[PDB]
């Protein structure tokens, strides 16, 4: 299971470039900030609703324990 | 001594007078008949909690 024995592959090409010939942060605050947006957006419509429920039960339970002793 | 002066200064705010008003009403009813059940430890507890909360902000200033 080494590199010369893995698969067979046809007519495709690639176009690399050196590390010492370019820059590491092309655009740091103009791409990353709109990026985090579409990510979180697309996904915080099915991660938040489950955790609202644990908050509603938490406040209903300490309220009852408190008023059963202190009238 | 400096605490003795500040305690009545910190009892001046109305956050602590109302629970103080509550303490007397049950206190006279309890002593009116030896047949009552309430012990005013509860109505005591509201008064000390409110008083000692407001004493905290200041007393360390009015020391030495």
């Amino acid at each position: 299971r080494e590199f010369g024995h893995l698969t067979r592959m046809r007519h495709v090409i690639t176009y690399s470039l050196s590390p010492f010939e370019q820059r590491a942060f092309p655009h740091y605050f103009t791409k990353g900030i709109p990026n985090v947006l579409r990510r979180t957006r697309a996904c915080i419509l099915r991660v938040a609703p489950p955790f609202v429920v644990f908050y509603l039960v938490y406040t209903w339970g300490t309220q009852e324990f408190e008023k059963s002793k202190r009238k | 001594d400096p605490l003795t002066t500040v305690r009545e200064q910190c009892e001046q705010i109305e956050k602590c007078i109302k629970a103080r008003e509550r303490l007397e009403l049950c206190d006279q009813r309890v002593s009116s008949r030896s047949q009552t059940e309430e012990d005013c430890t509860e109505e005591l507890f509201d008064f000390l909690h409110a008083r000692d909360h407001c004493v905290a902000h200041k007393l360390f200033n009015s020391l030495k």
Binding site: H11, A24, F25 | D1
Partner: protein, 241 residues
């Protein structure tokens, strides 16, 4: 089924982040323990070797070893004799055994005072709020012959008798020896006994936030300049028509 009162929070001079313990409230706090608290409570883990550089000079507290001389054990032909005491020796314990305590103190063994700070909800503000609290019994509660009323204590009735009031002690300096300030300088002495580490470690947490600072955006730079070859590659697929 009885409720418990929680001590509030106070602005101590050693409260958070970077601030230390002022060694004058501690210098003036052993004495309040020494001439009031001690004749009942023990400090066995705490020894006179400890205070050589926190509150007193080496001979200044050495002279406190001669104030009381501890009983000794087996030596030649005349053992059980008395020795003046030296730097090594521990805080002398009051009774022959702890079982003597129930004899004189109503069957209530006094808690030790080495960890009393850490072994309590509250902390160094539960003890302070205990001291000034002692109050009046309300209308309709009975007590034993030897019990006292305190709305902070969980049972609301503690054997101990109020050991601080006005003019109890004479400070060696002349600060007004009042109940308000004797209580504070006891709550400071015990805390440092709970931890002797509280000041050495606040200084290794500031010289470390600086090594990380220098080295944690330089590994980030190497990492970023190996993945650029890999992050800027385009690709083909023209198949045979």
């Amino acid at each position: 089924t009885d409720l418990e009162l929680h001590a509030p929070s106070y602005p101590w001079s050693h409260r958070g982040l970077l601030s230390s313990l002022d060694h004058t409230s501690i210098r003036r706090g052993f004495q309040v323990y020494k001439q009031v608290c001690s004749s009942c409570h023990s400090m066995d883990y705490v020894a006179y070797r400890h205070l050589v550089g926190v509150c007193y000079t080496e001979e200044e507290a050495k002279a406190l070893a001669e104030e009381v001389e501890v009983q000794d054990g087996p030596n030649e032909d005349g053992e059980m004799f008395m020795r003046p005491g030296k730097l090594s020796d521990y805080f002398p314990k009051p009774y022959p055994n702890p079982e003597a305590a129930r004899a004189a103190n109503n069957g209530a063994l006094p808690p030790d005072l080495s960890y009393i700070v850490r072994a309590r909800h509250g902390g160094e503000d539960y003890v302070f709020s205990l001291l000034t609290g002692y109050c009046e019994p309300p209308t309709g509660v009975s007590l034993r012959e030897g019990l006292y009323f305190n709305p902070y204590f969980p049972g609301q009735a503690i054997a101990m008798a109020p050991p601080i009031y006005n003019e109890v002690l004479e400070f060696d300096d002349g600060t007004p020896a009042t109940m308000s300030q004797v209580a504070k300088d006891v709550c400071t002495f015990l805390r440092w006994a709970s931890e002797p580490e509280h000041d050495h470690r606040k200084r290794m947490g500031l010289k470390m936030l600086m090594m990380m600072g220098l080295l944690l955006p330089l590994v980030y730079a190497m990492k970023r300049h190996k993945w650029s070859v890999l992050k800027s590659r385009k690709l083909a697929y023209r198949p045979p028509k």
